[PDB]
Amino acid sequence: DEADDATKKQAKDTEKAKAQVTYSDTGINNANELSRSGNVDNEGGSNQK
Amino acid sequence: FAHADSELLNANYFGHLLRLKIPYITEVNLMIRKNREGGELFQLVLSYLYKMYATSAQPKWFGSLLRLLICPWLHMEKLIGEADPASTSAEIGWHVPREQLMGFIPYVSIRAPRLVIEELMEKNWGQYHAQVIVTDQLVVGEPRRVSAKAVIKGNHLPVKLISRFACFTLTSKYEMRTGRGAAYNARLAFRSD
Amino acid sequence: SFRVALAGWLYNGVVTTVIDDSSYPKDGGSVTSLENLWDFFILALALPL
Amino acid sequence: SMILTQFGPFIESISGITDQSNDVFENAAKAFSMFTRSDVYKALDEIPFSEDAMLPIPPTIYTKPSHDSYYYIDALNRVRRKTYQGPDDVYVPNCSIVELLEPHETLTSYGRLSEAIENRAKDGDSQARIATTYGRIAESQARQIKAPLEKFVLALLVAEAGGSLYDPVLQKYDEIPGLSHNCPLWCFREICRHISGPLPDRAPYLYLSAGVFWLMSPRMTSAIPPLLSDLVNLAILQQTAGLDPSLVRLGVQICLHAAASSSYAWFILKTKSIFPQNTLHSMYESLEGGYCPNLEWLEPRSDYKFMYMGAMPLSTKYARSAPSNDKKARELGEKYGLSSVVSELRRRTKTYSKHDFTSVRYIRDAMACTSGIFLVRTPTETVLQEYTQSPEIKVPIPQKDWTGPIGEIRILKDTTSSIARYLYRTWYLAAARMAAQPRTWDPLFQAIMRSADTSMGPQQQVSAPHTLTADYINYHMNLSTTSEKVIPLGVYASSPPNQSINIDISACDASITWDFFLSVIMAAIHEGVASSSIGKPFMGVPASIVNDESVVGVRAARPISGMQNMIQHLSKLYKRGFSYRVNDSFSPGNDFTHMTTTFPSGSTATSTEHTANNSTMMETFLTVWGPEHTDDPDVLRLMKSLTIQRNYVCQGDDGLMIIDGNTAGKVNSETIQKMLELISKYGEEFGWKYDIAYDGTAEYLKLYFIFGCRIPNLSRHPIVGKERANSSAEEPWPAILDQIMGIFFNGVHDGLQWQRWIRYSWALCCAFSRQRTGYLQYPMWSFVYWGLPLVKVFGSDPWIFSWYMPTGDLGMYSWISLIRPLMTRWMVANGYVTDKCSPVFGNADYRKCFNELKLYQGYYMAQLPRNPKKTREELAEMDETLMRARKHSYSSFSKLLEAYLLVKWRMCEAREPSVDLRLPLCAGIDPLNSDPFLKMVSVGPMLQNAIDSALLRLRTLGALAGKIMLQDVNTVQLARVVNLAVPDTWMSLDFDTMFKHHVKLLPKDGRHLNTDIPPRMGWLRAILRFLGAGMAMTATGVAVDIYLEDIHGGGRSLGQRFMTWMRQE
């Protein structure tokens, strides 16, 4: 979702309908890409509570 | 006058469409003039909007209208001049019958030499019909006038119906020489001396 | 897509520049087609940046 | 019982009970003229109506305030109206009418428009022009009918008085609810009584040729004459189509809301899309079973060669995957007070879950309940509603991407950033490839192609190469236009694995202007032509020269070709706009001119270049604008797989795009919608407002399919509705029978209840037969000549022939050759015996029997011209010519029919079927509609002139022009020498396979030595094919394999009779 939002900001900065230089849906499979979120704590447990 | 080409085409304008330009830079005119009532750069932006709103037709050099406006009249006085003002002039206009309860508005005005207006007395000015609504008060210090409204029904007037030899004005308001007035099936009448 | 390709030479260990998918020949491509030869030409000329 | 005591022996003749006869026909037609208009309502007063016809008629129809606040007078002194709801509220309002009337003489109750008001309107009164405007437009709205409605209602009362009928196929009666359960006739009785009330003579308006008359009462408004013509259509179609009354009550309820509205025609314009939207656009939310066809079109896809390969059952996955309908379909009903109709339609639509004949006839009966009227408005508002709109260009092409003028044309530099270069290169390549053709340069073809304002009640000399290069795009570059084969396109496109997108362009005439399209096109044609043509002139325009500023370096002279000289003289016409001129007879003092950018309505060359412009912009959509403006690579993969040669078909403004099924099933129905949004976004950038539609069906050239369905639109044409544009009187009386036959042949192609439809066609046929001039009268055989099948004649079985029988002599051959050994028995059955035996009818005098029964006189009287060709005295000349045929006694038939009647055939065994029985091919026809269901399965549906006459006339007689002498053509072309044609009825069937294979010119037991066609004069086979395939289609039931049996005079002496007819011409 951060890649999608950065692609949309790329389109807004280049001032087109489609960003020419995209970050998502490249040819590279990137299914193991993790990012930093609020689901995990600093320990390893989930943050449902 | 009109700003853009399509402004006279999306609104169904009736008349001759003239696309013109001047030999000047129209852009730097927009920074000279103060008292522009808004942003002084905003009107340049608004000028760009009208320049892109128009179609891609080539304008036709404002002198192409100004020579038509001035140069036949200036050539006319070199040979019409000081013959007589009574019998060089004539005027075309709509004619209502006298039998009305409480009339000649002018349509164009023609100045020509004697032989040309004698050739203008024929070429009958029927087959041209309007519907004159004539009701107004006197407005100015000139004599009795009522600003009428004529709506032409039939075909409009050809120029080769007039001449190639006789100059004529292009624009005219409508007025005749109290009471009221209603829809009158008017006709034309060539008067002269 | 050219100027960002030049700017990506500075940042190698963070972001890597690739040619996008669907700049390749569609469906594998074939030599017998006219369009796929020029698609290969554009692609093979654009790759070394 | 009044109609029974009046019309005893006729109703039994057309219900299959008693034999049809001429004297009962003429004694009925004597009485059809002798009806007062009050007699029809007296006959309506006696029928007991059930409880399920009663519904509350609102009281607010009758009380409408008058027309003073509706119209006004514009500047330039033309009459208009001020709209109250929406800017398209320009139709006729509904107000009280009676205050503008003065009564006719000879009868007090009926009035017309008063002469004092039209006198003061011609004088120039303000109110009088408005009043006569409203009066003339109300007359023109009320006039839009074929004949007075009381005659149609009386024909309904005659035809539907015979009770239920009997089926010779299903061997049972039919179950159709009678006149007691018919809600439009209950309403038609109640309205026409409540208008009159205490006043007698009870007809709210009578209909004449030039004008109408109004019943003088305060209960009379303008909404009633369209409402009654609206109700009569539903009252007929509820009988003769077997409609469900639960849909007919909704169809009447919407019309009552229309009469109760502010305006009638405007409300129907806004509510014309309730029945297909709730029913057809929302079918099969849960699909469980049913059969579907299995088509494919062959691999050169521009050929449109199709193929039927069996039928497969549906599966669960082929449900309605299209998006929902509820949020706007319920909103349409909530705006207009029809939620009790819309929810009623939706909850009944949600109960069908299998694809068979039942759910298909549901769609047919739901589409039938729309009201087919003809919208009436003045021309002075038709122009100023249609011709005042304009396209909006949200992304115009910039002023940098043009050079200076070459005369009056600026050229587009190819380094532009906009999309218009792809429009430029197609027209440029088109001009460059049409100019290099050798055919455009001989003077004979230029003479052949040779061979100001416009108004309404010389562009075609200089606008040639625009059309000439439009044709090259339509027929050589992108063969997406199908400008007979439209049917299998939609039957493939409506199948389960594929979808279809109904793309329609709104305002195709106001679409293209000088702003985006015409400038680029006239820049491209001025440059593609000037390469090949240099100095060479056109038809009549010479070569020329004009200055340029193409490059900004210098300017020079650059001589003009002569073919681009028309582009020079024609772009100055397109650059300004068009000039129109109007004068309506519906409002006096209303005569002006008007300047637009739109095109004329129905020209010929205005279609082809619009189709080229459709296909070009669709191709550059799918090629360039598509991939450059979307994420979601499912959409990208979908766009990169289809092109307009493979799936896009366009004929006018509208188009159809087909998205085939993949290996995994159907395409994901959400990415299709994501592409639809991009089509709508793409149209805004250059002015087109697409009318895209995605529901699971196919709409192309106004034909409706679902799972390959052939759904007819019953309300596409009404029965009692006729268009009238002017205020002039119509043609005289003996030409109304052409429109009555038009009613019948239009009912053929729609799958009506055929026993009911033929029985009602007889009632109309006998109602329109007599006129004052001894009076003129057509016998009933004159209509049998015109293609009208019969019921029971000459002592035969009832309901024995079909309406697939042809008209003319080929029609007269077939039923006589089927019934002949019974007819020759019936003649002898009452004293018609002569001593010699004829080779056709035997020992019975066919001449005296046919003279007394007036069969000959109908046969020759039907061939008289119904056109009063170029005054009442010419009408009297035609009447005396028509009476002379009835007074003359006749000897025999024509030479062609007598030469036909020597041929005898045989019905040995039925052919194997051509299509599955359980497959729903076509809507309305099912085993409940027995005869088309048998014919269409046994034959198969169609799934795959003076020069040609006279050269065969001289070829078959003893006498390209070097090619024709020895070759042959097929049967349908070779057999036009005796003026035989495949009729209008057989067009939706497969006559080709039937002619080629299943009509054998050889008996089953070998060669009888009598049927020996010589090697010379082998053209006779192509006529014997038609004479064989006549009776195999006229006989009801299964189309049977037919074999030749006998030619009485010999096969050599058979064609000598045809040669005598060819010498006699």
Q: Which residue has the tokens 């200036």?
A: B74
Q: Which chains touch A (3 or more CB pairs under 8 A)?
A: C, D
Instruction: Answer yes or no: do A18 and D629 touch at CB < 8 A.
Output: yes
What does DSSP assign to residue B133? Answer: B
Q: How was this structure determined?
A: cryo-EM
Cα gap D632→C22, rounded to integer Å: 12
Find chain D residues with C-beta within 8 A of A22's C-beta: 631
Reference D983, options D775, D772, D786; nearest CA is D786
Instruction: Answer yes or no: do A17 and D629 touch at CB < 8 A.
Output: yes
Q: Are C43 and C24 in contact (CB under 8 A)?
A: yes
How many CB atoms within 10 Å of residue D773? 12
- Angle at alpha carbon of residue D676, lines to D672 and D681, rounded to 5°: 150
Reference D1021, options D1058, D984, D1061; nearest CA is D1058
Find chain C residues with C-beta within 8 A of D633's C-beta: 21-22
What is the 3-class SS of D261-316, one letter each residue? CCEHHHHHHHCCCCHHHHCHHHCCCCCCEEEEEEEEECCCCCCCCEEEEEEEECCC
Q: Are D861 and D779 in contact (CB under 8 A)?
A: yes
Structure tokens that stand for D82 in this block: 């001020």
Resolution for the entry shown, Å: 3.4
- Concatenated DSSP letters for D149-216? HHHHHHHHHHHTTS---B-TTT-SB-----GGG-HHHHHHHHHHHHHHTTSSS--SEEE-SS-EEEE-
Is C4 in CB contact (< 8 Å) with chain A? yes
- Residue of C21, C22, C23 best to disrupt the D interface, most CBs of D under 10 A: C22
Min CA distance, C3 vs chain A (Å)?
Answer: 11
Find chain A residues with C-beta within 8 A of C24's C-beta: 27
Three-class secondary structure of residue B188 per DSSP: strand
Most distant CA pair in chain A, distance: 43
Three-class secondary structure of residue C48 per DSSP: coil
Instruction: Answer yes or no: do B56 and D515 touch at CB < 8 A.
Output: yes
Instruction: Answer yes or no: do D388 and B12 touch at CB < 8 A.
Output: yes
Cα gap D784→D774, rounded to integer Å: 24
Is A22 in CB contact (< 8 Å) with chain C? yes
Q: Is the Cα torsion angle D223, D224, D228, D231 positive or negative in sign?
A: positive
Cα gap D930→D720, rounded to integer Å: 27
Instruction: Answer yes or no: do C20 and A28 touch at CB < 8 A.
Output: no
First to last CA, chain C: 11
The packing angle between helices D754-767 and D224-240, to 10°, is: 130
Residues 6 or more apart from A17 whose CB is under 8 A from it? A11, D628, D629
Is A25 in CB contact (< 8 Å) with chain C? yes
Instruction: Answer yes or no: do D636 and C22 touch at CB < 8 A.
Output: yes
Instruction: Answer yes or no: do D631 and A17 touch at CB < 8 A.
Output: no
Nearest Cβ partner for D514 among B13, B57, B185: B57
Min CA distance, D933 vs chain C (Å)?
Answer: 47
Q: Is the Cα torsion angle B72, B78, B81, B87 positive or negative in sign?
A: negative
Buried b (16+ CB within 10 A) or exposed e, B62-87: eeeeeeeeeeeeeebeeebeeeeeee
Q: Are D680 and D501 in contact (CB under 8 A)?
A: no
Residue D393: closest C-alpha in chain B: B53
Interface size A-D, in CB pairs within 8 Å, comes to 12
Is D127 in CB contact (< 8 Å) with chain B? no
Cα gap D941→D992, rounded to integer Å: 11
Residue D911 Ramachandran class (φ > 0 left, ψ -120 to 50 alpha, else beta): beta
The H or E element spanning position D126 is: helix D126-142
Instruction: Answer yes or no: do A18 and D633 touch at CB < 8 A.
Output: no
Residue D501 Ramachandran class (φ > 0 left, ψ -120 to 50 alpha, else beta): beta
- Interface residues from chain B to D (CB-CB < 8 Å): 6, 9-10, 12-14, 17, 51-53, 55-58, 131, 133, 151, 153, 182-183, 185
Structure tokens that stand for D469 in this block: 């290069």
Q: Which chains touch B (3 or more CB pairs under 8 A)?
A: D
Buried b (16+ CB within 10 A) or exposed e, D163-183: eebeeeeeeeeeebbebebbb
Reference D121, options D110, D109, D134; nearest CA is D134
Half-sphere exposure of D760 (CA within 13 A, CB side): 26
Q: What is the CA radius of gyration of chain D?
A: 32
Pairing of strands D354-355, D289-297: parallel
Min CA distance, A23 vs chain C (Å)?
Answer: 10
Instruction: Answer yes or no: do A18 and D630 touch at CB < 8 A.
Output: yes
Instruction: Answer yes or no: do D633 and C21 touch at CB < 8 A.
Output: yes
Find chain A residues with C-beta within 8 A of C1's C-beta: 20-21
Is A1 in CB contact (< 8 Å) with chain D? no
Is D640 in CB contact (< 8 Å) with chain C? yes
B in contact with A (at least 3 C-beta pairs within 8 A): no
- Angle at alpha carbon of residue D1032, lines to D1031 and D1035, rounded to 5°: 70
Min CA distance, B72 vs chain D (Å)?
Answer: 26
Find chain C residues with C-beta within 8 A of D638's C-beta: none
Cα gap D543→D961, rounded to integer Å: 38
Question: How long a stretch of residues is chain B?
Answer: 193
Min CA distance, A27 vs chain D (Å)?
Answer: 11
C in contact with B (at least 3 C-beta pairs within 8 A): no
Min CA distance, C8 vs chain D (Å)?
Answer: 23
Min CA distance, A45 vs chain D (Å)?
Answer: 34
Half-sphere exposure of D88 (CA within 13 A, CB side): 11
Buried b (16+ CB within 10 A) or exposed e, D960-999: eeeeeeeeeeebbebbbbbebebbebbebbbbeebbeebb
Instruction: Answer yes or no: do D631 and A7 touch at CB < 8 A.
Output: yes
Q: Which residues pair with D166 in a beta bridge?
A: D173
Instruction: Answer yes or no: do D631 and A24 touch at CB < 8 A.
Output: yes
CA D36 to mean position of chain CA atoms: 34
Q: How distant, in Å, are the alpha carbons of B132, D96, D164 from that of D224?
A: 40, 11, 32
- Residue of B5, B7, B8, B9 best to disrupt the D interface, most CBs of D under 10 A: B9
Q: Are D955 and D965 in contact (CB under 8 A)?
A: yes
Q: Which chains touch C (3 or more CB pairs under 8 A)?
A: A, D
Residue D640: closest C-alpha in chain C: C26
Residues 6 or more apart from B143 whose CB is under 8 A from it? B177
Structure tokens that stand for D501 in this block: 């997108």
Find chain D residues with C-beta within 8 A of C21's C-beta: 633
Q: How distant, in Å, are the alpha carbons of D595, D956, D963, D1019, D1023 from that of D967?
A: 57, 12, 7, 11, 17
Q: Which residues pair with D544 in a beta bridge?
A: D560
Find chain D residues with C-beta within 8 A of B182's C-beta: 124
Residues 6 or more apart from D436 whose CB is under 8 A from it? D532
